[PDB]
């Protein structure tokens, strides 16, 4: 089931591949470049974090989110592939990184200050 | 101002600032206590009193309040959805995506969302949804 | 406020005082605007203890299983801790607690003390099993044993049926013995008859024992269709539990024998 | 057992093994006297007209005995 | 307007019947502190001040050295009118 | 005999003079539909221990000295268990437990001050009062469920 | 406090190595690493990871935060490659 | 451009540096000291926010879907009620010309009319009767609001005894079920989706009957002019050569036997709507009018509660009966439009910053010591409290005989085991404590003794005597 849902998207990134147009053959590219470096899709990290927002909310927003999203193609995802997504601990580096493109010197003082903190709880 | 809203150590002076806050608040919810207490008849009350203040509080407006008294697509585009259109529920919520309703009030109101794993002071978890972009 | 508290009753407005009160209870000295220390509070609790029968204790223990166990088995002990250090109030013993970091981030979440509502939901549930179906079962056993044995008992409430029988071998003991009258010691005879006979034996100290898996080494009744058929014959003709109203025991036409048969001789 | 009659003398049908076991099962958990003495001719029935007696159907009937026991001592116990 | 003496004679009974210097069986309608209660002349000011708990109302200095009974006791506070 | 449904069990009761607590098998507490409770009883022992007790002795309580028959050791275990069952509860397997008294004193004031006023009994509840501001009535109280509709999409007539 | 699933030998035979394990899970407690459980047989054990190949992501690590903590000598190459990821059962080691 | 999808990292930088410059300005205002330098920076933000807005406009136009689907939606509807008023426009031009030939004047009239419209690109009748609907409605929410003010001294208060989503539904369909007299429900749901601008009046009516207890149908003349408001605005060879679209092959007929329950889910979708614009316009009623009747002058109050007793009087003797030009006023609306969409933006980050110091308040709000209790009168229990309980003892002795009517005592507190009862003797003050007296008349001998002795007691510090250190409070009345 999920190879199959996996060729009705990628039946859109051919069409757009083979479209003519260049947003839509550079976008294609994009998707393709992604797939073949291993990189994964921000749409499961959107499903996941969609679908534990869906099982940890009321039954209002339960109702409002199944409601929202009854006519979008969502693939059939089982608790356990959330799971293994939510408890995997995040990299340093790359939040490292992202605070550093983010915020400039302040984020340099913010990370110096982080650091003070790990050092402070070593001993 | 408008060159003050970019990364690339630009606005230092409020984006210490906001960086700081996401601390002190990690260090509070965390490291404080003393914030554990069962609410009782004072903190009902002027708890209370601090709800009627702050609506009390009205914004100031700016001077855009004030007002005195074959056609293109595009421009009767905008004079029809004025006219026929005066509360759109679409587009309020698409404002709610910009200003990122109880933005840094939500990571700690949700249910299972902390891990007990980034439960220390050390812990990098309220930069989580920082992107450069 | 008006807005939170528009129409309740007085029980409504006695039980929300009371909650308040105890709300804002705090031990420091006498004289300084605090209404007892924390010595005095252990002093009440002394006496308090001191004061009380068996039925005390026990009703003491029953609140400390009801209420406080399912909070202790979810908190952490630094949990404890510092519930200590709200008891004895001392500045300094809070500020010696709050230097140490390994204090501040061990306190329990609100998401796993979630769970102390539903152990007490099911410690509460066993207790309401006991107190309140008890009566109700002990009543119907008790007028007409014949009309609602304890099989029918426990299909038509669903419990079990060693758990009905506990119950009501201990309803009858807890009503002996909150009374100074000797139980009836023929009752768990009658209601665990072939527990008393299969179960209960006498023990020495410095050995340990076994259970027999079957009483006799024999063949068995499904390598043969007759003694399959003889074996659906006889539970056919046999009951399924057999309590003392029934036809075998018949025979105990005086009550000098009822009580002579169910009475230190039983295992005779 | 009017229509298993009727579906046997008249219509000369062959009962399958399932509603052999029906007419077991309906025999044993019925705790009138008797019940038993008839999923014996039941099992005759099947034992002397080719129908397969599986081991499951045995200990099926043991455990349908034994639980339908209550049944029979509450007609007992209304005598 | 007045309570009747019935009633404020049985709520005076229990006040002296709780005191733990006393005895429950000794007390009589017409009986005195010192003499047959066997009471010091410190309680008989105790005594005064569990009535003036008992009946809400306060009871003068002058009035409390006038009562040195039970029979007084019960009269004086039937004549009292702003007992409820 | 009769006396096996519940309508002759209480007019029985009736004629005895007692009147049923329990009137039908909805009022009735079920213990087969436990689960941390048996799990608790299996590995470690009797959490309650005084559940059975005629006279004081058939109590089952850790000893007062210590070591591993000590409180601390029976409390860490069945804090294990209950760990374990939420565990269960945060992958989904168990439904999401309502607001304890306990938990309800420990979280943010603000928290607190939000659940008096809307009367959430569970945490999803909570939070359908945090995200939808414009459901609760005027003096901060919950609306039921039934009274909001979300929008429905013409891309599920396809 | 040890656990009853996990935590358990399957052999008779006494190592004699306790007091180490001890020290070794005095050693690796932190913060944290007095509430979960003690293995005095941690050496001895070998739990194969289930988890080989599948998504990594950026800005997550490949590790997670509920994982049995290695020993001084596993390493995970040691499980070959037409069995990495397929055992669901943990191992004990025996020295003949 | 700042609100499309590329900037958007840029665009929360500048969400929070406008929630921190709100965060100084509230702060500011609430404790009045010096608020003109934080309403200069957050002018400054705002022109900045409104020229990003005015090209965000645009970019949102070109890129964002949701704007071109709301935009393709508000078209429709456009032209929906332009062919629904164009055909009654029609029918009563069709009337008009076939009651009298002669209507030349009417006719360059209608001509007239119809090239303003084309011009203006709009329907200029329907926009004017639905600004007319619009008008009737406010007037009508004004005057209730008023009343509701004025007689019973109340406002609007949406409690749990309002009409439901349910009834609301019910009683809309029993409304249009009376009017066509045949209906499904996809009839109800074309209509409603076809009005789509309706400003609706009858549940707030509902709920000013059910507080006031009068009829509201014919009483005022604001019903009676949104009523007459509602009554005036209420071949196959071509076919084979008209392409067909593929889109509309993709989706179901209307009149399709699977579709039921997404009309029913579309018919409760669109009536929460209408209750949740109702709710918002009576919110608002009562919160910009209705501050003015707390400070309402006590005339007005008097005489109208004078009224509301006459109309108490009334329903009572009613029960006694019973029994060059065009483009600057186009960029004037361009701008009128685009500082609408900046104080919409800045109305909901302003709510934003409001909640946000709301949770940050209730935080440092846990810290502060409770209240003090007043000084209350000893509690005692007087003989007259256990003569008048003694039937009550006696009920709750015999009830906590049986074990069915143990816990149905009526008085039962409690204390860690124990369960409190009905005192049967007064507990008095004064009463008791003569045998500590005398014990501390052999204590205070024995200090005596000691201190001309001169003996010390057992260590009040905690040696190994005595771990748990015991120390008697040390008096100053009691200092030798």
């Not at chain 3, 058929?229 to 036409?253: G, H, I, K, T």
Request: aromatic residues 10%; proline residues 4%.
């Amino acid at each position: 089931e999920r190879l199959a849902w996996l060729r009705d998207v990628w039946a859109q990134i051919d069409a757009d591949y083979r479209s003519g147009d260049s947003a839509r053959q550079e976008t294609a590219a994009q998707e393709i470049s992604a797939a073949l470096r291993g990189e994964p899709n921000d749409y499961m990290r959107w499903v996941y974090e969609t679908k534990r927002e869906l099982r940890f909310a009321g039954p209002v927003g339960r109702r409002a989110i199944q409601e929202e999203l009854q006519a979008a193609e969502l693939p059939e995802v089982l608790d356990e592939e959330v799971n293994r997504y939510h408890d995997l601990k995040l990299n340093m580096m790359e939040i490292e990184r992202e605070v550093k493109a983010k915020y400039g010197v302040a984020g340099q003082q913010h990370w110096a200050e982080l650091q003070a903190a790990k050092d402070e709880e070593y001993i | 101002c408008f060159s003050s809203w970019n990364d690339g150590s630009e606005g230092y002076e409020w984006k210490s600032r906001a960086l700081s806050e996401k601390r002190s608040l990690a260090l509070e919810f965390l490291g404080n206590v003393n914030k554990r207490v069962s609410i009782h008849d004072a903190i009902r009350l002027k708890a209370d009193i601090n709800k009627k203040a702050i609506s009390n509080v009205s914004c100031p407006s700016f001077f855009s309040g004030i007002e005195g008294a074959h056609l293109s697509p595009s421009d009767a585009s905008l004079l029809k959805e004025e006219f026929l259109c005066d509360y759109d529920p679409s587009d309020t919520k698409r404002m709610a995506k910009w200003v990122n309703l109880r933005s840094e009030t939500s990571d700690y109101q949700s249910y299972g969302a902390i891990p007990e794993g980034e439960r220390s002071l050390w812990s990098a978890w309220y930069l989580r949804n920082i992107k450069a972009g | 406020a008006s807005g939170k508290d528009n129409t309740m009753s007085d029980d409504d407005v006695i039980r929300n005082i009371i909650k308040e009160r105890w709300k804002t209870l705090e031990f420091g000295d006498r004289n300084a605007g605090y209404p007892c220390t924390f010595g005095d509070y252990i002093q009440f609790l002394n006496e308090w203890f001191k004061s009380l029968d068996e039925e005390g204790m026990q009703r003491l223990r029953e609140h400390f299983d009801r209420r406080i166990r399912p909070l202790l088995a979810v908190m952490s002990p630094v949990d404890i801790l510092w519930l200590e250090a709200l008891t004895q109030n001392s500045p300094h013993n809070k500020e010696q607690l709050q230097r140490k970091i390994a204090f501040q981030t061990s306190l329990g979440t609100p998401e796993f003390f979630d769970m102390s509502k539903r152990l007490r939901y099911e410690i509460n549930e066993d207790y309401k099993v006991r107190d309140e179906l008890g009566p109700e079962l002990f009543a119907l056993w008790s007028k007409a044993p014949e009309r609602w044995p304890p099989e029918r008992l426990s299909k038509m409430y669903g419990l079990d049926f060693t758990l009905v029988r506990k119950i009501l071998v201990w309803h009858h003991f807890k009503a002996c013995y909150d009374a100074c009258v000797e139980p009836d010691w023929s009752l768990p005879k009658r209601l665990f008859a072939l527990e008393w006979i299969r179960d209960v034996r006498a023990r020495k100290h410095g050995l340990f024992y076994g259970k027999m898996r079957f009483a006799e080494q024999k063949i068995t009744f499904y390598s043969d269709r007759f003694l399959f058929r003889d074996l659906v014959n006889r539970r056919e003709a046999s009951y399924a539990n057999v309590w003392e109203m029934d036809d075998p025991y018949r025979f105990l036409q005086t009550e000098q024998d009822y009580e002579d048969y169910w009475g230190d001789n039983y295992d005779v | 057992e009017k229509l298993f009659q009727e579906m046997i003398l008249k219509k000369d049908l062959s009962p399958s093994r399932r509603t052999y076991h029906c007419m077991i099962f309906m025999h044993l958990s019925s705790g009138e006297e008797g019940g038993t003495a008839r999923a014996l001719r039941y099992l005759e029935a099947m034992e002397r007209a080719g129908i397969q007696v599986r081991p499951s159907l045995l200990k099926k009937i043991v455990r349908v005995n034994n639980a339908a026991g209550y049944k029979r001592d509450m007609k007992r116990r209304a005598r | 307007y007045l309570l009747n003496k019935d009633d404020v004679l049985t709520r005076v009974l229990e006040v002296v019947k709780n005191f733990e210097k006393v005895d429950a069986s000794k007390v009589t309608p017409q009986s005195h502190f010192v003499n047959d209660l066997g009471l010091n002349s410190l309680d008989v000011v105790e005594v005064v001040f569990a009535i003036e708990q008992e009946f809400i109302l306060d009871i003068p200095d002058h009035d409390a050295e006038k009562i040195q009974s039970i029979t007084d006791a019960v009269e004086y506070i039937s004549q009292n009118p702003m007992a409820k | 005999p009769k006396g096996e449904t519940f309508e002759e069990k209480n007019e029985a009761l009736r004629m005895m003079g007692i009147t049923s607590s329990f009137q039908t098998k909805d009022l009735v507490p079920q213990p087969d539909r436990q689960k941390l409770l048996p799990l608790i009883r299996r590995e470690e022992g009797e959490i309650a221990g005084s559940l059975w007790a005629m006279d004081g002795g058939e109590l089952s309580y850790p000893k007062d000295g210590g070591g591993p028959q000590g409180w601390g050791v029976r409390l860490w275990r069945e804090r294990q268990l209950v760990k374990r069952e939420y565990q269960k509860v945060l992958d989904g397997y168990r439904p999401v437990p309502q607001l304890s008294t306990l938990g309800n004193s420990v979280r943010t004031a603000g928290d607190q001050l939000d659940i008096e006023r809307s009367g959430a009994q569970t945490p999803g509840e909570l939070s359908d009062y945090r995200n939808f501001p414009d459901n609760r009535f005027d003096g901060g109280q919950l609306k039921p469920e039934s009274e909001a509709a979300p929008a429905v999409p013409f891309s599920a007539e396809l | 406090f040890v656990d009853l699933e996990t935590g358990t030998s399957l052999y008779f035979r006494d190592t004699r190595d306790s007091a180490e394990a001890i020290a070794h899970a005095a050693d690796s407690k932190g913060i944290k690493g007095m509430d979960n459980a003690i293995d005095l047989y941690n050496e001895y054990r070998i739990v194969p990871d289930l988890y080989p190949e599948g998504f990594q992501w950026k800005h997550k690590l490949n590790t997670e935060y509920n994982q049995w903590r290695s020993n001084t000598w596993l390493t995970p190459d040691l499980i070959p490659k037409e069995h990495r990821g397929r055992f669901l059962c943990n191992f004990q080691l025996n020295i003949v | 451009s700042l609100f499309d999808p590329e900037n958007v990292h840029r665009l929360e930088n500048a969400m929070t540096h406008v929630k921190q410059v709100f965060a100084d300005y509230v702060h500011k205002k609430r404790e009045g000291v010096s608020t003109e330098a934080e309403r200069r920076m957050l002018a400054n933000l705002t022109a900045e926010l409104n020229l990003e807005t005015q090209k965000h406009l645009a970019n949102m136009f070109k890129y964002a879907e949701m704007r071109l689907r709301q935009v393709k939606l508000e078209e429709r509807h456009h032209q929906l009620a332009e062919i629904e008023r164009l055909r009654r426009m029609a029918q009563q031009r069709g009337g008009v010309k076939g009651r009298k030939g002669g209507s030349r004047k009417m006719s360059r009239m209608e001509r007239l009319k119809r090239v303003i419209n084309r011009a203006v690109g709009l329907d200029i009748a329907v926009a004017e009767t639905v600004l007319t609907e619009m008008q009737a409605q406010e007037e009508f929410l004004q005057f209730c609001e008023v009343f509701a003010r004025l007689t019973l001294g109340s406002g609007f208060k949406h409690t749990g005894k309002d009409e439901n989503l349910s009834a609301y539904i019910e009683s809309l369909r029993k409304l249009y079920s009376m009017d066509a007299a045949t209906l499904s429900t996809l009839d109800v749901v074309q209509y409603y989706s076809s009005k789509e601008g309706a400003h609706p009046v009858d549940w707030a009516k509902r709920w000013y009957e059910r507080a006031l207890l009068l009829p509201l149908q014919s009483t005022p003349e604001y019903q009676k002019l949104l009523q007459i408001q509602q009554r005036d605005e209420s071949v196959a060879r071509i076919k084979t050569q008209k392409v067909v679209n593929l889109v509309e092959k993709m989706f179901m007929d209307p009149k399709d036997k699977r579709l039921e329950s997404l009309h029913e889910k579309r018919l409760r979708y669109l009536a929460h709507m209408q209750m949740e614009r109702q709710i918002r316009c009576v919110r608002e009623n009562a919160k910009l009018f209705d501050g003015v009747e707390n400070m309402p002058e006590a005339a007005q109050c008097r005489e109208l509660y004078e009224k509301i007793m006459e109309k108490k009087t009334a329903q009572c003797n009613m029960t006694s009966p019973p029994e060059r030009s065009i483009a600057e006023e186009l960029r004037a609306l361009h701008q009128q439009r685009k500082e609408k969409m900046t104080m919409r933006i800045l109305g909901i980050i302003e709510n934003d910053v409001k909640t946000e110091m709301e949770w940050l308040q209730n935080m440092e709000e846990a810290e502060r010591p409770p209240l003090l209790p007043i000084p209350e009168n000893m509690s005692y229990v007087s003989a007259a409290d256990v003569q008048a309980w003694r039937e009550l003892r006696e009920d709750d002795e015999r009830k906590a005989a049986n074990p069915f009517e143990r816990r149905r005592r009526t008085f039962q507190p409690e204390l860690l085991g124990q369960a409190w009862s009905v005192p049967n003797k007064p507990l008095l003050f004064w009463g008791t404590g003569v045998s500590a007296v005398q014990q501390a008349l052999r204590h205070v001998a024995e200090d005596a003794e000691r201190k001309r002795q001169g003996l010390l007691l057992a260590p009040p510090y905690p040696c190994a005597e005595n771990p748990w250190g015991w120390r008697l409070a040390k008096d100053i009345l009691d200092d030798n």
